[PDB]
């Protein structure tokens, strides 16, 4: 499990997880609050 979590901590896996989180957050914000142009 230690070796597996080290693999999950390699740069592309962390990049995949973080960018999936960020893209999903942006997508769900735009789903819940459609068409934001201004604050």
Partner 1 sequence: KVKIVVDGNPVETSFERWAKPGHFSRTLSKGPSTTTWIWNLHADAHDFDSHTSDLEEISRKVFSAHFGQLGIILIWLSGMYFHGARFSNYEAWLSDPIHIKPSAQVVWPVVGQEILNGDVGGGFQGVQITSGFFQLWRASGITSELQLYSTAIGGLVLAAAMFFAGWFHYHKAAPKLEWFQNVESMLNHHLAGLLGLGSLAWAGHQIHVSLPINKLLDAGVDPKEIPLPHEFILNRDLMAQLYPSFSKGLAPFFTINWSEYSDFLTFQGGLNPVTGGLWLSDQAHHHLAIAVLFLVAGHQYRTNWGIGHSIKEILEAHKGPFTGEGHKGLYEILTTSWHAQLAINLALFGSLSIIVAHHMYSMPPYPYLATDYGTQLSIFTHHTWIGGFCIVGAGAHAAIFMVRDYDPTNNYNNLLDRVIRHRDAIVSHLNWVCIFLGFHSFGLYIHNDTMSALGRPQDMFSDTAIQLQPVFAQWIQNTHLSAPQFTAPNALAPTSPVWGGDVVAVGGKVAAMPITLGTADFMVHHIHAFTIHVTVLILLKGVLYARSSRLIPDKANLGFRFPCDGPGRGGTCQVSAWDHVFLGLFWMYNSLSIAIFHFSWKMQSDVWGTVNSTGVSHITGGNFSQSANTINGWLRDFLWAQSSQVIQSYGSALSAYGLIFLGAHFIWAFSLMFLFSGRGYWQELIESIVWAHNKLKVAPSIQPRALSITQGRAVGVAHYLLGGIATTWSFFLARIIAVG
Extract the annotated binding site.
28, 31
φ, ψ for residue 6, nearest 5 deg: -65, -40
Residue 6 binds which entry of partner 1, ligand CLA, none, CB below 5-8 Å type-dependent: partner 1
List the interface residues with partner 1, window 1-39 (CB under 8 A).
Answer: 3-4, 6-7, 10, 27, 30-31, 34-35
Q: Could you tell me which of 38, 36, 39 has the C-alpha nearest to residue 27?
A: 36
Region 1-39 residues binding ligand CLA, contact defined as CB under 6 A: 20-21, 24-26, 28-30, 35-37
Identify whether the C-beta of residue 31 lies closer than 8 Å to the C-beta of residue 25.
Answer: no
Residue 14 touches which of partner 1, ligand CLA, none (CB < 5 to 8 A by kind)? none
Residue 19 DSSP SS3: helix
């Amino acid at each position: 499990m230690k070796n597996f979590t080290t693999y999950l901590s390699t740069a592309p896996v962390v990049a995949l997880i973080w960018f999936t989180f960020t893209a999903g957050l942006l997508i769900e914000i735009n789903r819940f609050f459609p068409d934001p142009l201004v604050f």
